[PDB]
Every structure is written in structure tokens, then in C-alpha cells.
Design a protein around this ligand. Sequence first.
Ligand SMILES: [Zn+2]
Ligand SMILES: [Zn+2]
Length: 89
Amino acid sequence: GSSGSSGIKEVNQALKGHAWLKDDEATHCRQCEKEFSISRRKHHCRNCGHIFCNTCSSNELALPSYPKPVRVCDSCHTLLLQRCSSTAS
Ligand SMILES: [Zn+2]
Ligand SMILES: [Zn+2]
């Protein structure tokens, strides 16, 4: 014979988005998402060329553009570290 069973547990979902936000002059970091402060200055990457904080700029790497390793962002450091550059230029 056949013995079926109906009855599923579902939940309503409808999250609303409403929060004053604006990033024109790099109000906050583009990674950690933290409020910039006097002590926490900003750092303009040399590769990606973006705005980041000290926490997101505590790494250096020797790029093919510059002779010596400059201060880069974790987004570039880790990336370049987990990438494959076989004479790409
Ligand atoms: Zn940051
Ligand atoms: Zn970068």
C-alpha cells in the first residue's frame, strides 16, 4: 500500500533594509568596516589603490611596479600570496 504524510514547518521571511549610510569620502574602511579615527589614519594602497585602515594595511609585498616592497592591504597581500604570476606583464 501507500502511507503518505503532509506537514512541513515553514517560517515567514521579509527583512527590511533601513539604515542611514553614506560612503563618498571613505567614511569607513572597505574591509573591516570600522569608523576612522585620528589615531587610526588611512592608507592608500599602491596596487588596488583603495582606502583602508592601519589594521587593513599592516602588510608589505614586493610588486613588479616598484623596486622595493611597499605598504599594501590584506586584500592584495593574501591575494598575491594565493595567486599565480608567471611573468604576467
Ligand atoms: Zn580596516
Ligand atoms: Zn590593496
